[PDB]
């Protein structure tokens, strides 16, 4: 199958797996304004506003493709309007649907770039918020909502003029250290299988109806290759965070590039690099 056409501009939408500074900017604005419950995100033990110790995967992807990046993703973002952090809603809707809305409002009349790649990577916070705040919805129904929400984002961007998309699957929530510690490995498996079975069917139907260029990145296949043969990728430690934060911050491991996880939820820069390189692989430079 032929490589897809080159990419010169990316518009990225999603959560802390893509965020390159928005949760930092937004939370300082929320702190300055006095919004109740606001905290400085991501925190002290993170690199330059990323929720990791280096560039996120979409930033690597942009580098790999020779593209410029406008990264609208916000740490904590859910697939609908709002954030894992409920207190942000008093200031901005920073979920995927919020990000789409702000991107389209910020065009200032001008058209959508029909050549820009619209990059969508979200859903983990749907599961985390459900599990952390005792959500009552069955997981299959939550998965349904996540899927609807993502499809609706692509439909809305398409309606406004976007033509090119890369949508990332659920990551393997089942091996995230926070999920292991919460004894929630089976819930994560069931959730991520339901999103990843359904989403690509919905996206294929939309891609055909609206004549889109839509690529699907299966992040679970990707992390299964990394975790089955880690020495091949220079990785040694697959389960412990390099930078513990929970219950409290402790000293970082000395060899973070041999680690899969930076904190209890987020991958290291080395995993982000590998993912961004893999994501670039269906596109011509
Ligand atoms: C995990 C994908 C994200 O955006 S991190 C946001 C906050 N949390 C406590 C790690 C869920």
Automatic annotation (TrEMBL):
<dbReference type="InterPro" id="IPR001087">
    <property type="entry name" value="GDSL"/>
</dbReference>
<protein>
    <submittedName>
        <fullName>ChoE</fullName>
    </submittedName>
</protein>
<dbReference type="GO" id="GO:0004104">
    <property type="term" value="F:cholinesterase activity"/>
</dbReference>
<feature type="disulfide bond">
    <location>
        <begin position="242"/>
        <end position="253"/>
    </location>
</feature>
<dbReference type="InterPro" id="IPR036514">
    <property type="entry name" value="SGNH_hydro_sf"/>
</dbReference>
<keyword id="KW-0732">Signal</keyword>
<dbReference type="InterPro" id="IPR051058">
    <property type="entry name" value="GDSL_Est/Lipase"/>
</dbReference>
<keyword id="KW-0378">Hydrolase</keyword>
<dbReference type="Pfam" id="PF00657">
    <property type="entry name" value="Lipase_GDSL"/>
</dbReference>
């Amino acid at each position: 199958s032929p490589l897809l056409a080159p990419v010169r501009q990316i518009h990225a939408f999603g959560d802390s797996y893509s965020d390159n500074g928005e949760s930092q900017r937004l939370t300082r604005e929320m702190l300055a304004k006095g919004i109740a419950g606001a905290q400085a995100l991501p925190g002290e033990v993170y690199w330059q506003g990323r929720w990791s110790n280096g560039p996120t995967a979409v930033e690597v992807l942009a580098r790999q493709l020779g593209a410029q990046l406008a990264d609208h993703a916000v740490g904590g973002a859910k697939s609908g309007a709002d954030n894992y952090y409920g207190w942000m809603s008093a200031y901005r809707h920073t979920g995927l649907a919020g990000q789409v809305d702000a991107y389209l409002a910020t065009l200032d009349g001008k058209p959508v770039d029909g050549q820009a790649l619209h990059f969508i990577f979200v859903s983990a916070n749907d599961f985390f918020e459900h599990e952390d705040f005792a959500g009552e919805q069955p997981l299959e129904q939550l998965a349904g909502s996540s899927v609807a929400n993502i499809r609706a984002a692509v439909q809305r961007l398409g309606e406004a003029g976007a033509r090119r998309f890369l949508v990332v699957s659920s990551t393997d929530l089942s091996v995230v250290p926070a999920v292991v510690a919460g004894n929630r490995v089976e819930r994560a498996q069931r959730y991520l299988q339901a999103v990843n079975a359904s989403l690509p069917i919905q996206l294929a139907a939309l891609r055909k109806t609206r004549g889109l260029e839509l690529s699907w990145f299966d992040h679970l296949t990707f992390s299964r290759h990394l975790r089955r043969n880690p020495a091949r990728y220079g990785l040694v430690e697959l389960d412990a965070p390099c930078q513990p934060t929970q219950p409290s911050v402790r000293p970082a491991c000395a060899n973070p590039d041999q680690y899969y996880f930076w904190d209890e939820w987020h991958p290291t820069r080395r995993v982000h690099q590998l993912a961004g390189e893999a994501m670039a692989a269906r596109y011509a430079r």
